[PDB]
């Protein structure tokens, strides 16, 4: 629907943008900001079409096409499980963490290693509350690399509430 436009000369005005894009598709709205710190134009606009069909069309045909004031015009189109784990071994690599938690569940992102107190801790992002419950059940208070690690939910107070299972189930759905 709405498309971002950038690399715009502040001398390009609103009527000029409108007359420009009406050549491509019908334009529902144009938001073309006006700086209250420079009293002019900050050189990027937003053109809301009547649908994402004309929007994407204008993205395809318009991108890297029109040359305005010698500068080219750019167009660009415009919640997970988290486990805190404490007392990790210094020999535990982030990739090793990835290998350890892959068997329990798919990771939406990579673990985050940080130090509290000296105290090696990490945040592990699971795509599933139930697979997170698996890594908890098996890995809680366990000895890896000759070091006892604790696996629980990271704080937001901590994850794993009743509404959390309900909505995380939906985000899975």
């Amino acid at each position: 629907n709405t498309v971002y436009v950038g690399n715009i000369d502040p001398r390009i005005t609103k009527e000029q943008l409108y007359e420009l894009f009406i050549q491509i598709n019908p334009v529902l709205r144009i938001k073309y900001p006006k700086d209250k710190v420079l009293q002019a134009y900050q050189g990027y606009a937003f053109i809301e079409f009547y649908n994402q069909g004309d929007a994407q069309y204008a993205i395809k045909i318009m991108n890297n096409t029109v040359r305005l004031y010698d500068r080219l015009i750019k167009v660009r189109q415009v919640p997970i499980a988290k486990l805190f784990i404490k007392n990790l071994a210094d020999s535990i690599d982030s990739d090793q963490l990835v290998k350890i938690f892959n068997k329990f569940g798919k990771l939406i992102r990579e673990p985050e290693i940080f130090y509290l107190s000296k105290l090696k801790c990490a945040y592990v992002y699971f795509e599933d509350f139930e697979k997170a419950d698996l890594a908890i059940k098996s890995l809680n208070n366990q000895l890896v690399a000759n070091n006892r690690i604790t696996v629980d939910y990271a704080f937001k107070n901590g994850k794993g509430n009743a509404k959390y299972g309900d909505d995380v189930d939906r985000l899975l759905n």
């Binding site: 001398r11 390009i12 009527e15 000029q16 409108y18 007359e19 420009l20 009406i22 050549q23 491509i24 598709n25 019908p26 209250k36 079409f49 009547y50 069909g53 004309d54 069309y57 395809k60 045909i61 318009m62 096409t65 029109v66 040359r67 305005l68 004031y69 010698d70």
Partner: protein
């Protein structure tokens, strides 16, 4: 106390409503919320202008600083008193001229903007830009490019826009199926000036009140 804590949730109030999106969080403290939802959501009612709950006395507007002092309606500007008396930092006029401007020339004349049934003017709003907007949706049509934007685009005369080539591979605009452009669906020899294409409509009274004559009252 108890009455303040007795209030139903706004979402509990939404279900009673056929148009639930108008109701807002403050409607929870409506002393008669089930009724106020029915009135506020009734067909033709026009919700209260929202400048209430602001203490700014409805105009603090920064935009108010930059508003134009005034502009004569062009029909009255024809009367030339603009030059006769300088309002910005004696002019003998004709009775027939002024009278005809209001009546002969300006009978059918009407302000271009006005407003609609439910139009309400909020502080930050300025009608003028929307007037040039509505007038511009009128004048400007696809296939035509003014000489100013053409010069900025650096497109010389007789040459097609750069999106005609990508429009050759991608195809005509989905929004304009009837659009014609020289060199592709439309005759290149008809390329003239600022118009490289035009929409060809495929579609091809008296309103019981047709006056069939127009006669204004004469001053003399």
């Amino acid at each position: 106390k108890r009455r303040k804590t007795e209030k139903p949730s706004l979402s509990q109030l939404k279900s009673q409503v056929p148009y639930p999106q108008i109701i807002e969080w403050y409607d929870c403290d409506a002393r008669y919320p089930g009724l106020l939802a029915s009135i506020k959501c009734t067909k033709n009612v026009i919700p209260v202008p929202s400048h209430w709950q602001s203490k700014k006395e409805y105009l603090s507007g920064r935009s108010l600083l930059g508003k134009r002092p005034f502009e004569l309606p062009d029909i009255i500007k024809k009367t030339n008193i603009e030059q006769m008396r300088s309002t910005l930092p004696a002019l003998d006029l004709d009775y027939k001229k002024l009278h005809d401007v209001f009546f002969k020339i300006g009978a059918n004349w009407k302000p271009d903007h006005l407003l609609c049934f439910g139009d309400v003017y909020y502080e930050n709003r300025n009608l003028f830009e929307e007037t040039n907007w509505k007038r511009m949706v009128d004048h400007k049509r696809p296939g035509r490019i003014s000489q100013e934007l053409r010069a900025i685009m650096n497109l010389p005369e007789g040459q097609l826009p750069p999106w005609c080539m990508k429009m050759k591979d991608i195809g005509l605009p989905t929004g304009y199926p009837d659009l014609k452009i020289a060199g592709l669906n439309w005759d290149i020899t008809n390329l003239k000036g600022d118009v490289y294409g035009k929409i060809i409509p495929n579609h091809h009274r008296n309103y019981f009140g047709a006056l069939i004559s127009f006669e204004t009252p004469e001053f003399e």
